[PDB]
Amino acid sequence: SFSGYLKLTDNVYIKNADIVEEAKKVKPTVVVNAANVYLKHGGGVAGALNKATNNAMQVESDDYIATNGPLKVGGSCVLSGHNLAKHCLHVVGPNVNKGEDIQLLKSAYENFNQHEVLLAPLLSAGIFGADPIHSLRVCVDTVRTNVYLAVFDKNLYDKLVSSF
Numbered sequence: 653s654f655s656g657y658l659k660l661t662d663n664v665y666i667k668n669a670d671i672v673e674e675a676k677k678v679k680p681t682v683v684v685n686a687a688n689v690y691l692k693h694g695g696g697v698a699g700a701l702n703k704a705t706n707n708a709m710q711v712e713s714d715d716y717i718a719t720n721g722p723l724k725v726g727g728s729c730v731l732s733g734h735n736l737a738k739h740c741l742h743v744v745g746p747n748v749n750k751g752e753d754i755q756l757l758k759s760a761y762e763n764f765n766q767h768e769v770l771l772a773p774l775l776s777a778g779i780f781g782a783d784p785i786h787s788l789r790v791c792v793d794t795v796r797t798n799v800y801l802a803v804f805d806k807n808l809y810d811k812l813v814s815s816f
């Protein structure tokens with residue numbers, strides 16, 4: 653049901669799109685959230701996905717943290733996808749603006765290998781402060797399952813494709 657994606661490799665595809673609008677159209681099995689360790693969905697992809705769930709994602713996430721404590725940087729958890737997907741895979745990439753080790757980006761992408769197909773953003777890019785060209789290269793060299801990347805910024809999408 654994914655449409656309009658450019659094929660980059662055997663298993664990685666990319667499109668200039670808002671991941672929230674893509675999830676509402678496709679209703680995939682798994683949508684990836686660019687989470688932080690506390691699952692506090694304030695801005696970027698996380699704030700946008702949470703708003704589309706009418707804050708149900710944040711209520712579920714607060715119950716998960718009250719029970720389990722915070723995630724690790726590089727880690728993940730599977731929660732409901734609410735009205736957007738069957739499941740949401742909350743993945744924590746390193747936030748370079750907070751001094752987190754960029755080597756953890758490969759560990760973050762390894763979480764995608766537990767799922768046959770995913771709709772996802774570029775981890776650690778945008779407000780997380782890492783170089784998006786590096787994030788796409790780590791994605792391609794780490795993920796083996798089928799990943800559909802939605803990149804919101806038009807200008808960054810064009811740069812990612814033309815430098816691939």
Ligand SMILES: C[C@@H](Nc1ncnc2[nH]ccc12)[C@@H]1CCOC1
Pocket residue numbers: 669670671672696697700773774777778779802803804805808
């Ligand atoms: C990390 C990434 N943020 C998003 N990529 C996809 N869907 C999104 N929806 C809300 C944010 C968002 C970068 C910021 C703009 O494009 C690249």
